[PDB]
Amino acid sequence: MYYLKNTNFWMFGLFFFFYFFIMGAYFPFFPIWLHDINHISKSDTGIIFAAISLFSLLFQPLFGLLSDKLGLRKYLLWIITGMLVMFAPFFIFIFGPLLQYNILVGSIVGGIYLGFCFNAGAPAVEAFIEKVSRRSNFEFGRARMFGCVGWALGASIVGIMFTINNQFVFWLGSGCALILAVLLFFAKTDAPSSATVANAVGANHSAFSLKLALELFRQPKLWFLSLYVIGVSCTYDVFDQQFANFFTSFFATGEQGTRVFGYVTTMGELLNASIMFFAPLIINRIGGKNALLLAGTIMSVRIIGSSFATSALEVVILKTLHMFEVPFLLVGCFKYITSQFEVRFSATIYLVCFCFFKQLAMIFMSVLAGNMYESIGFQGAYLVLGLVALGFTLISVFTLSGPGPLSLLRRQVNEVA
């Protein structure tokens, strides 16, 4: 219909679709790539990943602030497709070497740029396309749902095709990407048609600063939210970032190990939907403060649930749990801010609580972990994380902010209205 007939919807609705392919392959492929293909150790991964964060810390913000000065100008988005496109050449020829010839520290730092095109770029493409939705009429609401397919599909084809010829996967990741990427730029949207002239008129913006900041640190709830996020995402994320290779110990063969993974991730998002569809009700019904906990608990159990694991089928069950925590954390982390936080603070919150304060820890924990793995084995270290994990989730229960602060209904009218 009008949301399926128009130029831009189709065009970008695709752009979404083919982002995930490349992301798809990229993410899982990565750990596995390193292993089977780059005989990578923990020290190396640990840093590889961790490092990545640094640029997920120092690259993305400047990159989102540039999104405004740019307004709805495609300039930067191209700077994305550009670097994405040499995905195959870059990876095969750059990391491989810097790494394989025996020179790790540089292959990481120096590789976490075409590599940045998938952390910031996400909120990137997720953003721009969003402003284009306000210009045409149909919400990124159905654009992400359309683009998410590519994620499902790719992953599957990833495992399969991967082991058969990883050299290949990149080819089709970066190929369909580029070709279609550029294909989708020649057809765009430039000027208004009743949708206001100035870029500062339709999407509007938000702001942050020292006082805002200086005020947040004054608050105690930041301290107690951060602990949560920081403690628990750091932990959990580090875990999931190298959890794969472990999953891959459990199979008849490496070739089939990999496969299952693609299946899972893929079969996952279909669980993602089912959940989130209820997420809001569930949450509201429940409560921010709770949403998170339940989320963190799960995670804990998904970790501790790995030091006591032996079967491959038993790992299947442990992954799944990933998708149980997604919705709830996103949703909760989101509605808990809005619920115990003055709206003028969101932007600052993310910036300070999730961009300068999350990403930071990972750079450290990751390495800690990597090391713990090499020097103590997967499951062994886990008791450390998962424990710490649950230990921090527990404290949050007994210490996060009131499920119903000193005026829940009044502000719960604030979220509704």
Ligand X SMILES: OC[C@H]1O[C@@H](S[C@@H]2O[C@H](CO)[C@H](O)[C@H](O)[C@H]2O)[C@H](O)[C@@H](O)[C@H]1O
User: Helix count (H) and strand count (E) of the chain?
Assistant: 23, 0
What distance separates the 2 farthest-apart alpha carbons in the chain? 63
Fill in the amino acid letter for 381: A
Least Å from the CB of residue 23 to ligand X: 6
CB nearer ligand X, residue 119 or residue 136: 119
CB nearer ligand X, residue 104 or residue 351: 351
Q: How many residues bind ligand X, per CB under 6 A?
A: 3
Cα 14 to Cα 7: distance, rounded to the nearest angstrom: 11
Binding string, 207-246, against ligand X, x = CB under 6 A?
------------------------------x---------
CB nearer ligand X, residue 104 or residue 262: 262
Binding string, 304-343, against ligand X, x = CB under 6 A?
----------------------x-----------------
Question: Residue 177 interacts with ligand X (CB under 6 A)?
Answer: no
CB nearer ligand X, residue 270 or residue 317: 270
CB nearer ligand X, residue 23 or residue 37: 23
Least Å from the CB of residue 230 to ligand X: 12
Least Å from the CB of residue 237 to ligand X: 6
Least Å from the CB of residue 192 to ligand X: 31
Contact assessment for residue 372 and residue 380, using Cβ atoms and an 8 Å cutoff: yes
CB nearer ligand X, residue 98 or residue 292: 292
Number of other CB atoms surrounding residue 338 within 10 Å: 16
Q: What is the per-residue DSSP string for 174-214?
A: HHHHHHHHHHHHSS---S-SSS-SSHHHHS------HHHHH
Cα 152 to Cα 253: distance, rounded to the nearest angstrom: 23
CB nearer ligand X, residue 326 or residue 381: 326
Least Å from the CB of residue 355 to ligand X: 9
Least Å from the CB of residue 265 to ligand X: 9
Least Å from the CB of residue 375 to ligand X: 25
Phi-psi region of 287 (alpha: psi -120 to 50; beta: other; left: phi over 0): left
Least Å from the CB of residue 165 to ligand X: 25
Binding string, 19-38, against ligand X, x = CB under 6 A?
----x---------------
Least Å from the CB of residue 253 to ligand X: 27
In this structure, is the dihedral angle defined by the CA atoms of residues 130, 133, 138 and 144, taken in order, positive or negative? negative
Applying the rule CB under 6 A, the residues between 67 and 96 that interact with ligand X are: none
For residue 417, what is the DSSP state?
Answer: -
By C-alpha distance, which of 218, 211, 226, 224 is closest to 350? Answer: 226
Least Å from the CB of residue 286 to ligand X: 20
Q: Is 52 exposed, middle or buried, given 0-12, 13-18 or 19+ CB atoms closer than 10 A?
A: buried
| The pair of three-digit structure tokens given for residue 98, joined into one six-digit string | 């810097």
Q: What is the per-residue DSSP string for 218-257?
A: TSSHHHHHHIIIIIIIHHHHHHHHHHHHHHTTSSS-HHHH
Binding string, 143-162, against ligand X, x = CB under 6 A?
--------------------
| The pair of three-digit structure tokens given for residue 23, joined into one six-digit string | 């992301």
CB nearer ligand X, residue 189 or residue 242: 242
CB nearer ligand X, residue 30 or residue 189: 30
CB nearer ligand X, residue 355 or residue 408: 355
| Burial letters 357-371, b for 16+ CB under 10 A, else e | bbbebbbebbbbbbe
For residue 345, what is the DSSP state?
Answer: G
Applying the rule CB under 6 A, the residues between 372 and 411 that interact with ligand X are: none
Number of other CB atoms surrounding residue 241 within 10 Å: 23
Least Å from the CB of residue 324 to ligand X: 13
CB nearer ligand X, residue 104 or residue 128: 128
Residues forming contacts to ligand X in the complex (CB under 6 A) are: 23, 237, 326
